[PDB]
């Protein structure tokens, strides 16, 4: 019943009143994302590439997504199911591939799409390729905060809702490393029942909601030099796209 943020994590759902906290142990699938950089001149097509180490075909959808990340700011969605245009989103962004191979095809390249790209699976749990920086050969300011800790330490994060129904909808936080790297760290079903964690922060990091009040949180405890990253909130829409992220708040841990 309760919506999930990944395709495998409706296994676990049980008619039963149960709480789950979930850890998958199935082979990880990896995302080769490439190149790792690359720079055109305005107007040329820019190419990036996934592989995934096992098929992405699952008769209920294809769940590859794309993001675009600037600096300073949360990724945004772009792709979702492999080739799906997100809404209001350029035409000139475009998706395709099946089994293990997709694409994304940006094309004419425009000054405004300097950025960095990732792909992303949301077959099992969720795993993101390393990123292409795509470098080109409206005055904005986009804040956030962040706090340094100990190791061993503690600390909880939050994230609000408003503007649709939060109840219904899976929420995730993913965390971004200093080397760029986005990590999955926690997902929690909507109704509050199934909670998911990758093994790298399990028995750490606590992943909770409440939908009385929409609120989201993260607990994390025994904090290691390892957790530092920027620590994203995010929903779980169509065909498990993450497609609403809220700005990052910064943990540093260090001693």
């Known amino acids: 019943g309760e919506a999930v943020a990944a395709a495998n994590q409706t296994e676990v759902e049980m008619e039963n009143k149960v709480v789950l906290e979930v850890l998958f142990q199935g082979p990880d699938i990896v995302l080769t994302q490439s190149p790792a950089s690359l720079a055109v001149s305005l107007g040329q097509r820019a190419t990036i590439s996934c592989k995934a180490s096992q098929t992405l075909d699952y008769d209920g959808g294809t769940y590859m997504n794309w993001y675009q990340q600037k600096p300073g700011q949360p990724p945004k ?24 191979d997709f694409t994304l095809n940006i094309h004419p390249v425009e000054e ?7 792909c992303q699976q949301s077959r099992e749990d969720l795993t993101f390729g390393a990123g292409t920086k795509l470098d080109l050969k409206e005055v904005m300011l986009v804040e956030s905060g962040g706090v340094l800790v100990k190791p061993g330490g503690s600390l909880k994060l939050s994230c609000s809702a408003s503007g649709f129904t939060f109840s219904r909808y ?10 760029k790297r986005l990590e999955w760290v926690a997902s929690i079903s909507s109704g509050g029942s199934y909670t998911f964690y990758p093994d790298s922060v399990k028995g750490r990091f606590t992943i909770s909601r409440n939908n009385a009040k929409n609120f989201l949180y ?3 405890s025994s904090l290691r030099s390892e957790d530092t990253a920027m620590y994203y909130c995010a929903r779980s829409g169509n065909d498990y796209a993450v497609d609403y992220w809220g700005q990052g708040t910064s943990v540093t841990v260090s001693s």
């Not at 962004?93 to 099946?98: A, D, Y």
């Not at 405004?112 to 990732?118: G, P």
């Open 77 to 100: 969605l772009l792709i979702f199911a492999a080739s799906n245009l997100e809404s209001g989103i350029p035409a000139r962004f475009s998706g395709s591939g099946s089994g293990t």
């Open 112 to 118: 405004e799409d300097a950025a960095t790209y990732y």
């Open 170 to 179: 899976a929420m995730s936080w993913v965390r971004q490393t200093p080397e």
């Open 218 to 220: 993260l607990k994390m």
